[PDB]
Amino acid sequence: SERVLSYAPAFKSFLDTSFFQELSRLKLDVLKLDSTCQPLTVNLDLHNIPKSADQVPLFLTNRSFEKHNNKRTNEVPLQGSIFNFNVLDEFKNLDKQLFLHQRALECWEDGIKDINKCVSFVIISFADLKKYRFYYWLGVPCFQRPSSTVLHVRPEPSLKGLFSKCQKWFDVNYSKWVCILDADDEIVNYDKCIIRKTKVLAIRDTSTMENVPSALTKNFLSVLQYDVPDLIDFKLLIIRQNEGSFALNATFASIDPQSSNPDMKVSGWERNVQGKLAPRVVDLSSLLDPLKIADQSVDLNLKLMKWRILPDLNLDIIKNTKVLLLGAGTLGCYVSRALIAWGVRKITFVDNGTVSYSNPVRQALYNFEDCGKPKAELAAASLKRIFPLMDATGVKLSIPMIGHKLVNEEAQHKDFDRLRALIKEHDIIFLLVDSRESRWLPSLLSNIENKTVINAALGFDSYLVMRHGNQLGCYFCHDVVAPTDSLTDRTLDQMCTVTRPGVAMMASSLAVELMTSLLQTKYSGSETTVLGDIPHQIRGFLHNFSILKLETPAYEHCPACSPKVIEAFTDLGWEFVKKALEHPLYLEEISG
């Protein structure tokens, strides 16, 4: 041309998770905090450099720690080291240039004893185990000694049939980075006495960049100039295991030559893709953190329903529905499991009671060890123990039955306000109380806060699932059974009733499926969504394995949502409620 020889970075780092796993293991084993230094090994495959790369992959795994873990054929072992730091400040403040230069001195010391041993690499690192975050920077010390020396080059097409011999010589001689020609133009190892006469140097190149040799070339050149100070012109073959080998006519030039202890210019810190000389930081939590890995397998499960079967399903509006479960009894436990199976993440229990001896067989959140402990809090804790990402919370909080004189005005007034706030804070409200008297106040507050309310109630062998919605009746608009009905259909929502174990299971499931279907977008002109019908009320009986769906209008004179009852409320606040809890015949007068 002629040109000044410039260089490609030698290597491209690839970090396997197993590398960070093996790093963590070794780091959990020590308590001392001192920075540390361990040898590393990679085996380079110069025959498999991916087309979109410009240099050989340098692939770190757990195996890189384990000395020389065997080796293939035609692969080149690369010796390195990792300096791990245990204080991010040390990692941050380490003079990076000074560090790489000191590494280059070691390579130089090695190099002048054996030109093939002047090549290594270094990783510096900080591992934040709790956050699964790993900081790192690959450095490949590439040195120009002295720094004043540079290389004028121009093309040498002629030396072309040579390349095959070098390629093949290198595959065999896997620990060599360099070779030379002797007097008959045959490949031999590097000897300074020979190359002084022969003037031909071939380098095993790590770059694929067209006409641009890997920066390791500086290293070999520096050693050469030191073994042969008077060498000015030589041929330089850049050997690669593709078809991109080339030959150069080479001349040592010099820019600001100092005179007799040579200095050193070192490059080689690896860049990120933004082209910046900066450290890498990686979050490997999604690959390593058991909790985050589970969150992912679960979200995948729910997505498969949507990809395999119901493409139009909205899984996210469920996920973000904040659910208040009024009741941590049989229903509350089961509803809540259905909910988590659906990806609901915020569930808040409300229950004023204590786990009892007979509870754990029926109430699927409690163990025998739990007896005697408060239910609500413990239930939230049982959810977290199942899936720790759960924003599960428990509030011990009595709900005033209607038709009862009070027992503590101040304590219950605090309960009341605390109830209403829980509702306003939440998106969907499940009424899973023991009887209907405990059902009235939640209903009213939900009708006033305009919330979607799924009610569930149990009789000996029957259940009732209904939704008051955002007009549809509420639980109280109409009687829920005739007074004529069977003695076992009038057990519905009685506080004294034993139930067949299966009733709460069936009721819970239907309640949750009714919610998810209800969250979905309704179709044009029908009461259906992508998950099916959205019935107002569902009623089931086990004695004959049967299910009813039915509908009920809002009732003018209903004690819980009649418009004259809502009026009295927002006007006369808790004072109104108080009289209602105590004088039910008074509540009758407001509704009509």
């Binding site: 796993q21 293991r25 991916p50 873990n69 065997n70 990076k96 000389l277 900066a278 930081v281 992912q296």
Partner: protein, 186 residues
């Protein structure tokens, strides 16, 4: 026996793959190493096949910090291309090869499972794609698996179109439709 079923034995899997590593030298057999969890129906050095860092330039659908303010100051003063590791295993529960893939972004750091799915074809992703540790390493690494369930079936169909050496060559033709954005080095 195998173009009949579309299924191979352990003895035959070794052949179809000794052939592959000879024909496409980019695939290699594992090395005897201490972190593999060996299976006795195969040899130690013929457990499974590996190809490293195969590039994917496009995606399958078209083919507090603090850390950031820390990286900026530690600094001294097209993307993502991705790179995939492909492993070929033998299933016993079916008589077919099962493939696993482990990905890297353009900085050569590992891909999240979410990201790797982008390079699975939408059909194969929504019905036959799973997340799984590589079952032949101990201290184990996440990957996408794919995933029989079926397969030959699908392989015998490709054989409804001559020795057993080339069984894995044909399998690779299939696999390519699963991950259509990874280069065809195979």
């Amino acid at each position: 026996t195998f173009l009949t079923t579309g299924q191979i034995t352990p003895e035959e899997f070794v052949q179809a793959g000794d052939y592959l590593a000879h024909m496409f030298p980019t695939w290699k057999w594992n090395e005897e190493s201490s972190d593999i969890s060996y299976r006795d129906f195969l040899p130690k050095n013929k457990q499974f096949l590996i190809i490293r860092k195969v590039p994917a330039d496009k995606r399958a659908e078209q083919a507090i910090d603090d850390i950031d303010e820390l990286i900026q100051d530690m600094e001294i003063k097209m993307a993502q291309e991705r790179y995939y590791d492909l492993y070929i295993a033998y299933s016993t529960s079916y008589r077919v090869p099962k493939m696993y893939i482990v990905g890297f972004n353009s900085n050569g750091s590992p891909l999240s499972p979410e990201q790797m799915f982008e390079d699975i074809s939408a059909d194969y992703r929504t019905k036959t794609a799973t997340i799984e540790k590589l079952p032949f390493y101990k201290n184990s690494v996440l990957s996408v698996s794919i995933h029989p369930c079926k397969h030959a079936n699908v392989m015998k169909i490709l054989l409804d179109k001559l020795r057993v050496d080339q069984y894995l060559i044909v399998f690779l033709k299939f696999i390519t439709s699963v991950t259509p954005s990874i280069q065809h080095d195979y």
